[PDB]
Write an enzyme that holds these catalytic residues in place. Structure first.
Site, short mmCIF file in Angstrom:
data_model
loop_
_atom_site.label_atom_id
_atom_site.label_comp_id
_atom_site.label_asym_id
_atom_site.label_seq_id
_atom_site.Cartn_x
_atom_site.Cartn_y
_atom_site.Cartn_z
N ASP A 1 -3.38 -1.00 -6.68
CA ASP A 1 -3.31 -0.76 -5.25
C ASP A 1 -3.44 -2.10 -4.48
OD1 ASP A 1 -3.19 0.65 -2.80
OD2 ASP A 1 -4.77 2.04 -3.30
N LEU B 1 4.93 -9.98 2.59
CA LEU B 1 4.75 -10.11 1.15
C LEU B 1 4.89 -11.57 0.70
CD1 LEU B 1 6.79 -7.02 -0.14
CD2 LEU B 1 4.29 -7.22 0.12
N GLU C 1 -2.32 10.21 -1.64
CA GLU C 1 -3.50 9.35 -1.62
C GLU C 1 -4.09 9.19 -0.23
OE1 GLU C 1 -4.00 6.08 -0.26
OE2 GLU C 1 -5.43 5.08 -1.57
N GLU C 2 -3.24 8.94 0.77
CA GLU C 2 -3.75 8.65 2.13
C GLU C 2 -4.28 9.88 2.89
OE1 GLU C 2 -2.53 4.24 2.30
OE2 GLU C 2 -4.16 5.55 3.03
N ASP D 1 0.84 -1.18 0.00
CA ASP D 1 0.00 0.00 0.00
C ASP D 1 0.89 1.27 0.00
OD1 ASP D 1 -2.09 1.71 0.32
OD2 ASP D 1 -2.58 1.10 2.37
N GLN E 1 11.66 1.36 -25.28
CA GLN E 1 12.70 2.32 -25.57
C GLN E 1 13.14 2.29 -27.05
OE1 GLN E 1 15.71 3.01 -22.38
NE2 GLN E 1 14.73 1.34 -21.25
C1 LIG Z 1 13.96 -11.12 -4.24
O1 LIG Z 1 13.55 -10.98 -2.88
C2 LIG Z 1 12.91 -12.11 -2.34
C3 LIG Z 1 12.53 -11.80 -0.90
O2 LIG Z 1 13.66 -11.59 -0.08
C4 LIG Z 1 13.82 -13.34 -2.43
O3 LIG Z 1 13.15 -14.48 -1.96
C5 LIG Z 1 13.88 -15.14 -0.90
O4 LIG Z 1 14.84 -15.98 -1.46
C6 LIG Z 1 15.69 -16.69 -0.57
C7 LIG Z 1 16.59 -17.52 -1.46
O5 LIG Z 1 15.78 -18.29 -2.32
C8 LIG Z 1 14.87 -17.61 0.33
O6 LIG Z 1 15.69 -18.25 1.29
C9 LIG Z 1 13.79 -16.79 1.01
O7 LIG Z 1 12.91 -17.67 1.64
C10 LIG Z 1 12.96 -15.93 0.03
N1 LIG Z 1 12.14 -15.02 0.81
C11 LIG Z 1 10.86 -14.74 0.54
C12 LIG Z 1 10.19 -13.76 1.46
O8 LIG Z 1 10.25 -15.21 -0.41
C13 LIG Z 1 14.30 -13.61 -3.83
O9 LIG Z 1 15.28 -14.63 -3.79
C14 LIG Z 1 14.89 -12.32 -4.41
N2 LIG Z 1 15.19 -12.55 -5.79
C15 LIG Z 1 16.40 -12.38 -6.33
C16 LIG Z 1 16.49 -12.68 -7.79
O10 LIG Z 1 17.39 -11.99 -5.70
C1 LIG Z 2 -11.04 -3.62 5.43
O1 LIG Z 2 -11.61 -3.92 4.13
C2 LIG Z 2 -12.13 -2.84 3.45
C3 LIG Z 2 -12.09 -1.54 4.00
C4 LIG Z 2 -12.62 -0.45 3.32
C5 LIG Z 2 -13.20 -0.65 2.06
N1 LIG Z 2 -13.73 0.35 1.34
C6 LIG Z 2 -13.08 1.47 0.93
S1 LIG Z 2 -14.05 2.55 -0.09
N2 LIG Z 2 -11.84 1.81 1.34
C7 LIG Z 2 -11.09 3.02 0.91
C8 LIG Z 2 -9.61 2.61 0.83
C9 LIG Z 2 -8.63 3.74 0.47
N3 LIG Z 2 -7.23 3.25 0.52
C10 LIG Z 2 -6.61 2.52 -0.41
C11 LIG Z 2 -5.35 2.31 0.04
N4 LIG Z 2 -5.26 2.91 1.22
C12 LIG Z 2 -6.41 3.47 1.54
C13 LIG Z 2 -13.25 -1.94 1.51
C14 LIG Z 2 -12.73 -3.05 2.19
O2 LIG Z 2 -12.77 -4.32 1.65
C15 LIG Z 2 -13.30 -4.47 0.31
ZN LIG Z 3 -3.69 2.81 2.60
#
Ligand SMILES: *[C@@H]1O[C@H](CO)[C@@H](O[C@@H]2O[C@H](CO)[C@@H](O)[C@H](O)[C@H]2NC(C)=O)[C@H](O)[C@H]1NC(C)=O
Ligand SMILES: COc1ccc(NC(=S)NCCCn2ccnc2)cc1OC
Ligand SMILES: [Zn+2]
Length: 298
Positions: free
Chosen positions: A179, A267, A138-139, A99, A119
């Protein structure tokens, strides 16, 4: 045919993934990083900088960052995210990974992975160009309302609408707004009838990549359905000007949304990777297929 560049993606994400409330040091560093990055990816870069009084902080300086390839083209595909992070009194370290650090990294990485096209051959036309828009402010600063929200987008829409060279805002065929991307197993539904064909394109591309063995894991993220609700976001000031929108926001929201957990540790890389593969091909195909002006204002 378009290969991943995950090194670029990771290093880009690391550069953006810093506390970046509007007016903060990190926000300044990210702004500068975006501008530098766009320039190095071949974009004509512009900053739309302005002052505005907001709750809590009073007057702040906002800056939208916009990169364009083929700025004299008749029409544009526009891809967008917000680069500011949300102010939290009790969470000054908030980095808003989903976000929208990841969304912003995705746009830059899309430009990187299609660079051999964007390019080169892509420059030799006048029918379409590419815009990447990094919205500031945005926020909400206190509480999300029509007023306390989307400050940059409000300003940029007005700017684009107020210029002619048709109005500049009118040459945008569609605003594709990313988003809340980066969490595990995201689900994207079509929000609008007029951009349902584009949504169907994402669905078809994901199906095709899966059949070709090019996706990680077993989830499909692009759902063949229209969503029953809407998410308020940076596209609102663009709706106000009748700009078609494809809103690529995951619903349900990431579990971590607006909590201290919206960080790198939460993530899901395989989901991010699958998003990038579908998305980069979607963008390439849109640009490659373009001939006449696409007019989805219906
Ligand atoms: C890009 O970043 C991600 C996240 O750090 C990397 O994924 C990790 O990779 C190592 C090696 O494979 C693992 O031990 C971890 O478990 C992974 N972490 C996650 C959160 O997924 C990824 O390797 C990176 N990519 C490159 C090309 O460097
Ligand atoms: C918790 O789940 C929710 C909560 C709120 C809304 N509805 C709206 S209109 N939110 C405005 C978000 C604006 N924003 C975007 C990124 N940072 C802020 C929907 C949800 O689930 C579908
Ligand atoms: Zn937000």
């Amino acid at each position: 045919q378009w290969r991943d560049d995950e090194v670029h993606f990771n290093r880009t994400l690391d550069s953006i993934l810093v506390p970046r409330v509007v007016g903060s040091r990190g926000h300044q560093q990210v702004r500068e990083y975006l501008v530098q990055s766009l320039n190095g990816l071949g974009f004509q870069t512009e900053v739309d900088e302005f002052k505005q009084r907001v709750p809590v902080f009073g007057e702040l300086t906002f800056a939208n960052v916009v990169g364009t390839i083929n700025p004299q083209a008749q029409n544009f595909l526009a891809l967008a995210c917000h680069y500011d992070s949300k102010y939290f009194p009790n969470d000054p370290g908030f980095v808003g990974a989903t976000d929208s650090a990841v969304p912003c990294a995705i746009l830059l990485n899309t430009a990187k992975t299609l660079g051999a096209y964007l390019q080169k051959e892509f420059r030799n036309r006048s029918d379409v160009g590419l815009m990447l828009i990094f919205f500031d402010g945005e926020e909400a600063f206190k509480e999300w309302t029509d007023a306390d929200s989307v400050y940059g987008s409000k300003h940029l829409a007005a700017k684009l609408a107020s210029k002619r060279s048709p109005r500049n805002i009118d040459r945008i065929e569609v605003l594709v707004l990313l988003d809340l991307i980066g969490a595990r197993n995201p689900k994207f539904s079509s929000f609008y009838e007029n951009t349902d064909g584009l949504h169907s394109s994402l669905v078809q591309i994901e199906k095709s990549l899966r059949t070709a063995g090019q996706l990680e894991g077993n989830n499909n993220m692009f759902l063949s359905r229209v969503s029953g609700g809407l998410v308020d976001d940076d596209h609102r000031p663009f709706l106000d000007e009748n700009v078609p929108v494809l809103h690529l926001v995951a619903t349900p929201f990431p579990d971590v949304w607006h909590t201290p957990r919206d960080n790198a540790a939460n993530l899901h890389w395989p989901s991010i990777r699958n998003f990038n593969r579908v998305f980069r091909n979607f963008v390439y195909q849109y640009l490659k297929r373009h001939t006449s002006p696409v007019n989805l204002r219906f």
